[PDB]
Amino acid sequence: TINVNTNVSAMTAQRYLTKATGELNTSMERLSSGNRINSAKDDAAGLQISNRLT
Amino acid sequence: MTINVNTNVSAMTAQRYLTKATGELNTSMERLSSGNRINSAKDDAAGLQISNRLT
Amino acid sequence: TINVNTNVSAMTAQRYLTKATGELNTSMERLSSGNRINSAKDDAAGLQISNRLT
Amino acid sequence: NIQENVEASKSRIKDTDFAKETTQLTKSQILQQAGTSILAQAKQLPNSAISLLQ
Amino acid sequence: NIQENVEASKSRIKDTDFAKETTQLTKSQILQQAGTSILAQAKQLPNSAISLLQ
């Protein structure tokens, strides 16, 4: 309690900020490109079927 | 018995208590400056081992 | 005891203060530069790979 | 596309994450202040105790 | 997540509890001051007692 060498709350805040930033970047990419699935990570089966349909 | 010189006996007990207090104070100062309770194997063996493993 | 010739606590405090100040300087340099890696002493492999990528 | 990916990886390896480094900077600042306070406390008490005894 | 939890546990086991330790420091300081005051008080008046009347 009232520690110095470790700040667990700051670590959790950093983790959640990183998650928010990652989601923000993904959303920004999806907005700019105009496609929801730009890389296989977004969706595997979705990407496959979309490529076949295109 | 209870007969003591109070010159070279009371002085000895006072010196022992003062040395204990000074050692405790120095250890506490080390722990405050360093930010870690355990600074050597002497302070805590198992705790030091587990903390090293976690780090 | 109260020997005045040498106080080990002073040396310990000075050593930990020096460590803290060194880490403070490193953090300041990292914040100002913007690059986590600024010398080979920091991390050799990371510096090599990052230079190659740049 | 390859340049975008390479720049992303280069930034991740090299570019600093300001959250972590700012947290480290604040922690180091506080550690330095604590060190100075402890050093001030520890310089005066031991030397002064023996002089008081005399 | 595992790193955050590990850091929390390590802080539990190792990191200093300043609230307790500052109080311990002050208690030790008070005890040493009392010890020195008692050492000065004694060994001067009572010791001199066995001589002033002789």
Swiss-Prot record, chains A, C:
Subcellular location: Secreted; Bacterial flagellum
Further remark: V.cholerae is able to differentially regulate the flagellins within the flagellum maybe to produce flagella which are particularly suited for motility within a given environment. A flagellar filament composed exclusively of FlaA is fragile and easily broken.
Family, similarity comment: Belongs to the bacterial flagellin family.
Summary of subunit composition and partner proteins: Heteromer of multiple flagellin subunits including FlaA, FlaB, FlaC, FlaD and FlaE.
Function: Flagellin is the subunit protein which polymerizes to form the filaments of bacterial flagella. FlaA is required to form a core or scaffold into which the other flagellins are inserted to provide structural integrity. Essential for flagellar synthesis and motility; important for full virulence.
Stated name of the protein: Flagellin A
Organism for this UniProt entry: Vibrio cholerae serotype O1 (strain ATCC 39315 / El Tor Inaba N16961)
Gene name per UniProt: flaA
Residue window of the full protein shown: 2 to 55 of 379
